[model samples]
Target: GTSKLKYVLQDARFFLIKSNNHENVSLAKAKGVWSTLPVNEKKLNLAFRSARSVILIFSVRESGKFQGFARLSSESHHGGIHWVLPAGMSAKMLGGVFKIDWICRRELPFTKSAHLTNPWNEHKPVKIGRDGQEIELECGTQLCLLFPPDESIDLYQVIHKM
Candidate 1:
């Protein structure tokens, strides 16, 4: 008899949100600025159940506000890309749900090194709210927001197979 072996990779896709302090802005004030955004009725249940981790990348553009991205996925253990928000002021709230863009095939490790990036360049960390909301934002002093993830699961499947 032959034995069957199966393994599952549970990793997270993260959006980057920049910290205002990195941009010379006040940290205490920038911590929860997005908290004021209206409650997104759509919710992010799909992304939460599927993705192992959601990374939020924050950046401080030249504008000096805050720009962010929400990368979603379940292949964090294998390796996956991120999904950045569209360009505009509304992007700040993401309206409700946003899409993720798979741009890389190289999976990131589940370690601090995989999460570490030059604060001057980018920062990432998933922000979970008391209401079970998952958010990824660019924590820079510059202002920014996100658009919901692509509905097409094919985009995710293609990269996942690679």
Candidate 2:
């Protein structure tokens, strides 16, 4: 397996955000702008101008637990996609203002302890056969780090240090 850092962790994806405001997810973790949707913000701006990191798998949709992993700042702004849709959601849609790298946001909250482990069983980031079994995260959804429902679970080494 030729792993040039797992090919930069396979560019990266696996975003799902629908916050009931963990105080606005720490207000986007101290204002590092990450507001998305508005008909998927133009496919999240081509996966943030071709991902090598747009990873945000924080799912605080009800505190059922799945609130961690954040990194949506600037890969050179990647053409910064923030059309301003958060007075909010709908009204011709507009969202995404990338800036976040909380690494372990909320200290690994994939539900009541344990680090990231929701390869689609429920919580989030499973892609569920490409949008099927939904726990409702249309706030922002990407989920394509190459389906790891435990097929030997390399996951680009768990998406390069979670």
Candidate 3:
């Protein structure tokens, strides 16, 4: 008997958290979008915002070229660089491919200064603790959206892009 899964949210969406590898190459060469391509062509992308919808971008390349683009929601911790691996490819020896285009998040394009305001979007009730037999859950929000125990659970393995 191993049961402890909870998801209960009506609305408010932002999710995708973990693709860390962006050592700030001059902010991707001053945001020129792959500016003069070098510095191993950086890579730092992370997400997790649950309330202020539409944020499904994509990018994956292990030597297939580029395939992913969409941007709207901003700052829940962000970074970029679609792909560029040629000179001695070493995304830890060819392990670089990330995809998260939930239908281009409605074909991207949104502004209100990229719509900020996600202080954990309220809607609480998530307490899972039993530190003896090992059961602890803590999330202050980097991306969250719950209330799903059916419909073949796999919201892209809970919003993943790493």
Candidate 4:
């Protein structure tokens, strides 16, 4: 069995909101900020459940405003590629209400000896959300999001060598 892979959010500019209740939340004041210690050492399990979406800011100003962003969804069946938010939209609009959680999972270990299988090759059909979101890893391979503690305002990508 593969040892469980653990990831922690280092410095992320994101916010959580309930999808069914967007009106109650304030977009301007709802922006969230986190540091390295609290993120990597504690808090943020780096997983999401159903009905929740995380707004990952790629580029932001020193004042903590969205310059470039991507949205990730947490609705999956049998554990594969979930969903991705569409492009060409305002970060605030992308943050539009969602309810979201996480646990490290053990699977076949990624090893140089073993052949890496493309997740898209699986017979399981990819399901797109009603919002028509897309993924960064269009090849449909398993991907992991990482926020390095040393990097400033950057999100890292880890493609699983399954």
Off by over 4 Å in 2: 1-16, 19-47, 50-53, 67-88, 94-162
The CA root-mean-square deviation of candidate 3, after full C-alpha superposition on the true structure, stands at: 15.7
Q: Residue 30 in model 2: shift from native, Å?
A: 32
Q: What is the C-alpha lDDT profile of model 4 across 24-134, one tens digit per residue? A: 222212332211122221212343332133343221212122122233332221211112223443343433332222111111122321232333335222221111222
Highest lDDT: give the candidate number: 2
- Model 2 Cα lDDT, one tens digit per residue, 1-162: 324323433546645666544666666766656665444455555666766666666655556555555555552233333233344455233233556655444433333333323544555434221211222222223222222222322434335533
Candidate 2, overall lDDT? 0.46
lDDT tens string, model 3, 5-103?
123112323232211233322233234232211221122222223243233212122211112222222332223454344556454443332233222
What clash count goes with each model? 52, 2, 11, 4
Model 2's C-alpha root-mean-square deviation from the true structure amounts to 13.9
What local distance difference test score does each model get?
0.30, 0.46, 0.25, 0.25
Those runs of model 3 whose alpha carbons end farther than 4 Å from true positions after fitting are 1-13, 16-82, 85-89, 93-101, 105-107, 113-115, 120-162
Q: Any residue pairs clashing in model 4, and if so which?
A: 17-98, 18-98, 19-97, 19-98
Model 2 — TM-score against the truth? 0.27
TM-scores of the models, in the given order? 0.24, 0.27, 0.22, 0.18
RMSD per prediction, one decimal?
16.5, 13.9, 15.7, 15.5
State which candidate, 2 or 4, has the greater TM-score.
Answer: 2
